[PDB]
Each structure stands twice: as C-alpha cells, then as structure tokens.
Design a protein around this nucleic acid. Structure first.
Ligand SMILES: [Mg+2]
Ligand SMILES: [Mg+2]
Ligand SMILES: [Mg+2]
Ligand SMILES: [Mg+2]
Ligand SMILES: [Mg+2]
Ligand SMILES: [Mg+2]
Ligand SMILES: [Mg+2]
Ligand SMILES: [Mg+2]
Ligand SMILES: [Mg+2]
Ligand SMILES: [Mg+2]
Lengths: 53, 128, 109, 240, 125, 225, 63
RNA sequence: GGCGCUGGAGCGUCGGGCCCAUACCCGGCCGUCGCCGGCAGUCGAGAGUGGACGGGAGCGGCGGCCGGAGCCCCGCGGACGCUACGCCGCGACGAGUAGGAGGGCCGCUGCGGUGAGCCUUGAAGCCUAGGGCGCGGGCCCGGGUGGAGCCGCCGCAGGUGC
C-alpha cells in the first residue's frame, strides 16, 4: 500500500474525467499521526493570540 | 399497553435515601450537596455511631441493574428525530427522553416516529 | 366461633444495650415461660393486626380499617419463652407492648 | 429385545445399593452378557396441480421466521434437578392416616372437625366432615393447614370413588373469552353451582362414612362442634 | 487500512454520540448503530447496510464494491427489496452468506431489516 | 477422510475413558489400603498397652508428631516476635488453623506464640472433617476449593499424592512430603467456637483456652468447624 | 481482621504504552496477541519493551 | 450508674443454659489488587496432546474364496459477541490525620472543530408536596414564571468550585 501509488484522474470543470491522470504523490502515503497533528495544532493556535492583562 | 423491556430483573438499591451534607440541616448557606468532612474533630468524618453516613464505594449498585429506570429500560436523551434511529436496534433495552428545550411541534414528530419504531418515550405527552 | 390464635406481646427488637436490630422482633407468647416449650411455635405464622384511617382491601370481604403486617417465628430467644420473629416489614415501635397473633397455620402436629 | 427385570439391587439407604459392584456383576451374569460388535421428513413433495406448474412442489415444514426481534436472551445453563410439581414426591405427616379427625385452620370452614379420607396426587388431603354434621362437603385441604387429632375411625373397606381426583376438584372459571373491554358487567355465573355429580358423590361417601361415625358415642357431637382457644388453654400444652 | 482508520476515528468522529453512559455511531452503513470496529460502516473494505426505502415500503440493501475504495460516488451498490418479510430476510441472508460478504454481519442485517419492516407495516387499533 | 477422523476421535476418547477408569480404580484401592493401615495402627497401640499391663510394666506411646494449631487472639497489639512466628505458622487471622509437624524447632515456636494459640493433637476424624469440609488448595497462589481430585493431582501428583485420601494420609501420618502437602493446603478458616470458649486470655491448664491441650483439640475442632 | 500489609499490593509496571502513537498501538496489539497465543518468551520481552519509555529504550549504535 | 437488693440482686469456689461487636464462618452486591489470566478461532465444520504419504508384510467387522473410496445436504440453515482504551473468568483484599497518586460520561467560563444540534409552536435564569438516575461530585425529564439566546461530543486555555 505505502509503496503503491495509483493514478488519479483529473476532472474537468464540467465534473467528468478529462482523460489526464496524475500519479498519487508520495505524501498521501505518509504516516497519519493524529497525536502529532493535535500537538502541532495546539501549539500553533497560540501563536496568533493577542495579549491581555 | 406500554412497551416492555427485554428482561426485567429485580432492581436492588443498597440505599434509597440521599447522602446529605453534614450540618446542612442547621444552615441555609450549607446546601445538601455532599461534601467530604475534613475537620480535625469531625465526628461524621470519624464515623461515630448515630451520625450522618458518608458515601463510599460499597453502596455501589449492581452493574446489571445500574442506571435502570423502574420500567426496566435505560434512559437516552434525544434532541431531534435523527438521534432517535440510533435506538432502533437498542429498542428492547433503551428508552428515549426528548430534551427539555425541544419545541412542541418537533417533539410531536419525535413521539410519532418513536411510536413507529416501537421505541419507548418516558415523556411522550410533554408539550400539548 | 373461636380465637384460633395464641396471644403474644411485642416485647421489643433484638438488641444489645446500645444497639437495636429492628429487622427482627422479640415476642412473648402467653403461657410459654421456658425455652423447651417454644418448639411448638417455631415457624408459625404471626400477625400484627391494627386499624388505620383509610379503608384497605380485605381478602374475601369488603374493605375495612384493618391492616396486617405478616411475619413468622424463627427461633427461641433466651431461656424464658421469648421467641424471635421476622416480619415482612419491620414492626412499628408503637406496637411495643401490644398484641401479636400466632396463627398455628404451618402446623406440624 | 428382552423383558425388563426388577432392579436386583435392593435399596437399603437412599443412594446406596445393598450389593457391591462384583456382587451385582455376578447377580446380573455380566460374565456371559458380553457384546463386542453387531429421520423425520422435513420437506414433503406435493402435486401442485394445474397445467405447466412444473411437476410438484417440495414444501418444507416449519418455515423460517418472518420477523426477528432486535435482541434476544441467552439460554439458561442446566440444573440436573428441579423437577416439575407433577413429578414431586408427596409427603404425608405420620399423624394423618385415613379416618383421622382433622381440624381445619383456614378458609370458610375454619375450626371445623372433618374426616380424612385419602391424599390426592398433588398431596392435598381429601376430607369430608360429613355435610349433615358440619356442612363440609367432599373438599380438598392442605396438610400444612390442618391439625391431626388422635381420634380416628376405621374407614377401611369403604369405597372412595375413583373419579374423585385433583382434576375433579379443580376450580372452574368462565371469564374471559369473546370479551376484551368491560363496559357491561360480566359478573354473571359468579354464583357457583353445586353439580348433581358432586351431590351424588357426597351422598355415596356419607352413606358409608356416617354409620361408622355413629358407631362410637357422641363423635357426631364432637364433629358438629368447632375448635376454639379458651383463655386458659395453650396449644403447646394440648394433646390433640 | 481498517485498523489504522479505526485508531484514528474510534474517539474523534462526527458520527460519535456519547451520552447517558452510552455510545452510538450515526454513520450511514452501521448496523446496530454502535461505535465499534466490527460495525463501523466507513473503515472496512466491504460493508453492508440496510435502510428503509424512499417510500415507506420495502428495504434498501447497500453493499460496498471491491474496486472503487477511494471513489465514494460509485463505491456503494444499492438494491431495493419490496417482497414479503420472509422473502426479504431470505434475500439478505443469501446476499451475505452465499457471497461470503461479511458473514459476521448476517444476523445484524436480518434483525435490522425485520425492525424496518415492522416499523413500515401499518399500526394496529 | 471423515470415517477415518471419526475413528481417530472415538479411539482417543475411549483411551481417555479407560485411563480415567484405571485411575479411579487406583484411588479406590489406595483408600482401602489406607483404611487397613489406620485400623492396624489403632489396634496396635491398644495391643502394646495391653501386653505392657499384662507384664506389669508401662507402655509409653510415641510422642505425637502432628499438631493442629488454632489462632485464638486477634491482630491488635501483638509483639513483633509473636507476630513473626504467627506469620511463619500462617496464622494471620483469628480462628485460623494449621497442621504443624512437631519437632524441637516447631515446638519452641509454639511455646513462643503460646498465649495466642490453642493447639493439640488431632485424630483421624478431625483430619478428615477439616480436609473435607474446609480443605482449600493453594493453586497458582489462589484459594481453590478441593472439589475435584484433579486439583490435588495436578499440584501434588509428582509426590504421589493424587486424591483427598492421599492428602489426608500424608497429613495424618507425617510422611516424607508432609511439608509440600501441608503448604498446598490453604490455612483453615474456622468459624467461631459454637458454645463459646472458657477464657481466651489464660492457659488451658488454668481453666482457659490458650496453650497445649493434649487431645481436647478434637472437641475444640468439633465445635469450631 | 487479617495481619497483612498493603503497601506493596499494587505492582508498579507498564501495562500499556503511555504513548498515543497509533502505529505503536497497532503493533502492540499484534505482539499482545503473539505473546498471549505463543509460548515464545521472546514475544513477551518484545511486548514489555514496547510498553517502555524512551529513556528505557536507548538508541542502539551501528557500531 | 439508678431503683433497689439481706433463703442474696452481697462475698468466695464452681456447673449448665442464654445475650450480642463493624470480630469469626456461609452467602449476595460494590470497588481495588493479583493471575503482565482468557478471547483476533465470528473456525455450523473448526476438530487441535503430530499428521502426512508410499511402495514392504499382515490381521480384525461387512461387500460368494478375487473383491473397498466415502464428496454433508429430504432442510442451503444456525443466538450473542470483539467501543481490543473492549469483553470475560478466578482468587485475595477494603480503618485513616498530615501527605502522595489515579480516575471523574463531576461542575464553571472562553477558543478551535463537530452535532445539515436546540430555540418566539418559546433560549438563559429562577420557582416547584412532580418522576427519576448516580456511592458521590452532580445530571436528566414534568409543571410554572420568563422573554432571546443556549447546549452535547473531540481537543485547547483559565482570574474555574467556599
Ligand atoms: Mg440515590
Ligand atoms: Mg441547608
Ligand atoms: Mg483529633
Ligand atoms: Mg488488646
Ligand atoms: Mg446457641
Ligand atoms: Mg492483655
Ligand atoms: Mg476486612
Ligand atoms: Mg492501609
Ligand atoms: Mg481506605
Ligand atoms: Mg479565583
């Protein structure tokens, strides 16, 4: 699965397939890590904060 | 008449009264909500005879009959019709309560759908 | 036509000096003043019959004021003809010194 | 197959036979009775009839359920006992023998003295304190709720009718067919009717019990009287 | 994979309802509507679901095809069964058992179809 | 291969049934032999005493090699040495009983914990009642009731003890594997003595209950369980 | 009352990884099954090492 | 201790009965701990403490002394389960200040997501001899008042519980 990269059809503006295919980028087979995503999201949502006192 | 649960075991309650807070009878400022006494000389905390009883894990209900209503069903809160079909396969053991803030016209539809699905409602006539 | 039950007095609850076990009662059956004479009354049904304000249904009769707490004698108490009794509900404390009927119903003779 | 035999191991104490394993082996002659070596149609075929409907139909019995409940209850374990009430052994107190005068303790015949005839299949006693004496018909009673006195009459060689059984004395009811909701009172038939068969049986039994009652003095007066507790007498000191 | 997606969504899901010491899952293809790996209707390569028909008669049995796993538009095949109750249960039993298509959901699907048909039949008086 | 596998399973089940039958016959005959041994010992003591009395001498019986020890005092305010010896005797609760093989070391331990225990010399009936009514095994550190002989066999069969009768024999006649057989038994959790005690705070020879009562421990056991 | 001491009743040990790594939890499931259903003590050792913390799983150098 | 007690309800030596602690025994239920216990076998055909083959030479019970192939099907069928952070089994255990730790589907406020959430056919708040649930913190529902907003779940953050 991880080493297997299928072909995804590019859909035209009319919604149907245009006949063009793109190999699945390898980033879509990267490990799915909800704990790391939650950690990074938690620590980066604080960076836009505006101070109060 | 009323829909019946799958099984109706005898529900045994170890204690039926409430654990009132120590000295909640003597003061209005002290609500009856249980608070563990932590005074150094507290006789209720020290468990002297004839005093207010303290809650502990030994009063826990049987796990088979825990959270069971007197009808034998177990309660589940629903806010609309969509949250009612989750009980379609739990029909014989769980009954639905319509939430308190649901409007009359919506809870009429909820009651009708529950009657269709043979789901018991504990407040079927609540806004009419 | 006849009394058909033995008279007894609700003497009190099973108790120590400073602890009271209300789930069982002590009965003094009239004419039974030794422990060896109590064997007849073991297992016999006993009834605390009283009256109240509201009418209640009577089995085989019209509703009336009569109410009963049923029980039975379990074992002998002491050496002087006391017996212990278990009732369906714990006897009210106002019944101390009042009549209990021992009904002869589960006869072994 | 062969004819069934008696147990050949007499019981001396319940659960223990009188003879040992080898003794019963020799008694059974197992030394020569040695052996080494030598359904129901679920579906039925029926001619359906009619032209070009095929030959026949293979119709199965016990079709599969139309409906399944949302959830079921698991089956119980096995108890290796707990026989039904009809198969229970019936025990009778040794003081209750046929002809004994009993005292009824419960019911509308409370305190009356009746005559015991026989224990029935359910263990209930059949009594008739003769109806001419104390208005107690042929009637069932429970041995737990009677007092067996010491006075007895010899009711041997009298004929208790065979049909006098538990099914005979079982109560009958009318309600409630063809009626679901009560808007018109169904209090009819509430007057129980004494059957002519019951009257005939009562006469037949009493006609042969009464002469034996009159055979001893003032037993009829004893049976007419009812039992009571005087303030001086105590049931544990009373010999019955 | 099914197990990995389950580890992702076992506690964080929009279909997850946690109330009254109970838990439920409201995804479309969940028989028994319970939050569980076996009955989840999204994470498995093959799934079966039973729904009421658009009109209040019959059932719709939907099964997930094998090929288009990443193509949700054509991933599900729906058939409508509007026969008697026994025939409908037989059809569902044959679709699950004869095809060997998730045989562990056979009685769940049969019971759900029975519930739907009983709800669809007219009430009594 | 269906017929062949049916034959295989039938042969396996039949072999298992024959093995169970052989083991049951062995258990029966071992119990019979133990009965013979018990009556031989009981009659032998009487015969020896009789011949000594006939000769005009005295027959001193062998000093008892088995004791039953019952802890009679509670767990409050116990000195450290008494506490340690009670733990070594496995009497951590009041009215707990344990069989003790008697020798110099064990007797001196009993002397140490003398005020806290009542002990004596159990007889065959006492051993039988204790093992049968209150016998529990320490199987995988669990208190398991001795409801089957397989429970004893799986834990003590390497020592030759395979049944209730073998266990009772090893306890009564203190055998080679008495330590293993006794430690296999969970300490007996006896009830309160029905009819009460005389005085738990003093020795038996001064009208109380503590200490060594020679063979009145059997009376105590009868009232105790 | 029983004369025992309760201060050592609860054995302090890892029964599961404190980590929330889902891949680690999946392979902990795999080795839990293998350690339960096999007599290989290797699987038991590997499972208890999977439970461990990072300081208890030091890196191993190539040398 | 009081009333009282003197053929004792006093003193000394003893017997038999009897009374009851949260102690002991048996049983039920709750939790904790232990078995780093069992369950991926949902395997109604799985069948497992060895099977496979493949020819040696042999018996044993049936197919007139030569003899041998078995595949489920008159039924097409067969409860529940396994949020594996789940479920199940067995055993022992349960005092607690100062203090430590764990769990909290206990509670308050705000933020990111989510509930095709709730709501003028009535939100919040408040009142209530109303019905209940939980050991508990607390919570749900009915009735009234009120008149415009509010809540569940997954995370995040505190000026968070008298
Ligand atoms: Mg409560
Ligand atoms: Mg107050
Ligand atoms: Mg203090
Ligand atoms: Mg002391
Ligand atoms: Mg006694
Ligand atoms: Mg002292
Ligand atoms: Mg304890
Ligand atoms: Mg402690
Ligand atoms: Mg504690
Ligand atoms: Mg503050």
């Amino acid at each position: 699965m991880a080493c297997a990269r299928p072909l995804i059809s590019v859909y035209s503006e009319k919604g149907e397939s245009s006949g063009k295919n793109v190999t699945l980028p390898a980033v879509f087979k990267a490990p799915i890590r909800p704990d790391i995503v939650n950690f990074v999201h938690t620590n980066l949502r604080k960076n836009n904060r505006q101070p109060y006192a | 008449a009323a829909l019946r649960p799958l099984v109706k075991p005898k529900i045994v309650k170890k204690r039926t009264k409430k654990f009132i807070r120590h000295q909640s009878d003597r003061y209005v400022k002290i609500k009856r909500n249980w608070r563990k006494p932590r005074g150094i000389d507290n006789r209720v905390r020290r468990r002297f005879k004839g005093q207010i009883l303290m809650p502990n894990i030994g009063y826990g209900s049987n796990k088979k009959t825990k959270h069971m209503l007197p009808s034998g069903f177990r309660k589940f809160l629903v806010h609309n019709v969509k949250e009612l079909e989750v009980l379609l396969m739990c029909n014989k053991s769980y009954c639905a309560e319509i939430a308190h803030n649901v409007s009359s016209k919506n809870r009429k539809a909820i009651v009708e759908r529950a009657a269709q699905l043979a789901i018991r409602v504990t407040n079927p006539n609540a806004r009419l | 036509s006849g009394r058909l039950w033995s008279k007894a007095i609700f003497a009190g609850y099973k108790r120590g000096l400073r602890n009271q076990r209300e789930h069982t009662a002590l009965l003094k059956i009239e004419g039974v003043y030794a422990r060896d004479e109590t064997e007849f009354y073991l297992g016999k049904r006993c009834a605390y019959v009283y009256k109240a304000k509201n009418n209640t249904v009577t089995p085989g009769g019209k509703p009336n004021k009569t109410r009963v707490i049923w029980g039975k004698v379990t074992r002998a108490h002491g050496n002087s003809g006391m017996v212990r009794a278990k009732f369906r509900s714990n006897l009210p404390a106002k019944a101390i010194g009042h009549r209990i009927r021992v009904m002869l119903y589960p006869s072994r003779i | 197959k062969g004819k069934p035999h008696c147990s050949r191991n007499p019981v001396l104490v319940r659960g223990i036979g009188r003879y040992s394993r080898s003794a019963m082996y020799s008694r059974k002659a197992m030394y020569k009775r040695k052996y080494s070596a030598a359904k129901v149609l679920a579906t039925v075929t029926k001619p359906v009839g009619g032209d070009k409907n095929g030959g026949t139909r293979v119709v199965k019995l016990r079709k599969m359920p139309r409906y399944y409940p949302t959830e079921d209850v698991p089956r119980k374990l096995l108890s290796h006992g707990k026989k039904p009430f009809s198969q229970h052994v019936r025990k009778l107190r040794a003081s209750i023998t046929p002809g004994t005068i009993l005292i009824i303790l419960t019911g509308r015949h409370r305190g009356k003295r009746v005559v015991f005839l026989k224990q029935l299949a359910s263990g209930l006693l059949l009594v008739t304190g003769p109806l001419v004496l104390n208005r107690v018909p042929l009637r069932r009673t429970h041995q737990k709720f009677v007092i067996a006195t010491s006075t007895k009459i010899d009711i041997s060689n009298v004929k208790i009718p065979k049909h006098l059984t538990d099914a005979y004395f079982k109560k009958k009811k009318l309600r409630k067919p063809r009626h679901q909701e009560g808007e018109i009172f169904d209090t009819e038939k509430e007057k129980y009717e004494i059957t002519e068969q019951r009257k005939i049986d009562q006469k037949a039994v009493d006609s042969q019990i009464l002469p034996k009652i009159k055979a001893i003095p003032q037993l009829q007066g004893y049976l007419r009287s009812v039992f009571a507790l005087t303030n001086g007498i105590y049931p544990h000191k009373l010999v019955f | 994979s099914a197990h990995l997606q389950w580890m992702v969504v076992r506690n964080c899901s929009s279909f997850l309802i946690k109330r009254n010491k109970q838990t439920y899952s409201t995804e479309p293809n969940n028989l028994k509507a319970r939050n569980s790996f076996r009955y989840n209707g999204l994470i498995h390569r093959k799934t079966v679901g039973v729904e009421p028909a658009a009109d209040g008669k019959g059932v719709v049995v939907v099964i997930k095809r094998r090929s288009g796993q990443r193509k949700p538009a054509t991933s599900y095949v729906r058939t409508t069964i509007n026969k008697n109750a026994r025939a409908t249960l037989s059809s569902i039993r044959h679709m699950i058992r004869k095809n060997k298509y998730r045989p562990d959901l056979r009685m769940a699907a049969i019971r759900r179809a029975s519930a739907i048909l009983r709800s669809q039949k007219p009430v009594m008086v | 291969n269906f017929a062949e596998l049916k034959i295989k399973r039938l042969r396996k089940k039949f072999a298992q049934k024959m093995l169970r039958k052989a083991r049951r016959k062995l258990i029966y005959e071992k119990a019979k032999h133990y009965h013979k041994e018990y009556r031989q010992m009981y009659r032998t003591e009487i015969r020896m005493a009789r011949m000594a009395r006939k000769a005009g001498n005295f027959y001193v019986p062998a000093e008892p090699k088995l004791a039953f020890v019952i802890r009679i005092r509670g767990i409050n305010g116990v000195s450290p040495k008494v506490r340690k010896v009670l733990q070594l005797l496995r009497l951590r609760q009041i009215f707990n009983g344990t069989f003790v093989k008697l020798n110099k070391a064990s007797i001196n331990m009993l002397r140490i914990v003398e005020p806290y225990i009542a002990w004596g010399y159990p007889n065959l009936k006492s051993v039988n009642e204790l093992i049968y009514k209150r016998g529990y095994g320490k199987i995988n550190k669990k208190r398991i009731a001795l409801t089957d002989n397989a429970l004893i066999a799986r834990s003590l069969g390497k020592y030759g003890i395979i049944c209730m009768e073998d266990l009772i024999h090893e306890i009564y006649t203190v055998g080679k594997r008495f330590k293993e057989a006794n430690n296999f038994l969970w300490p007996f959790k006896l009830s309160s003595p029905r009819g009460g005690m005389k005085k738990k705070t003093t020795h038996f020879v001064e009208g109380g209950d503590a200490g060594n009562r020679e063979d009145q421990i059997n009376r105590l056991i009868r009232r105790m369980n | 009352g029983v004369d025992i001491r309760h201060n050592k009743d609860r054995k302090v040990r890892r029964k599961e990884p404190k980590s929330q790594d889902i891949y680690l939890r999946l392979l902990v499931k795999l080795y839990r099954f293998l350690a339960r259903r096999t007599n290989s003590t290797f699987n038991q050792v590997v499972l208890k090492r999977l439970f461990m913390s990072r300081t208890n799983r030091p890196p191993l150098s190539l040398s």
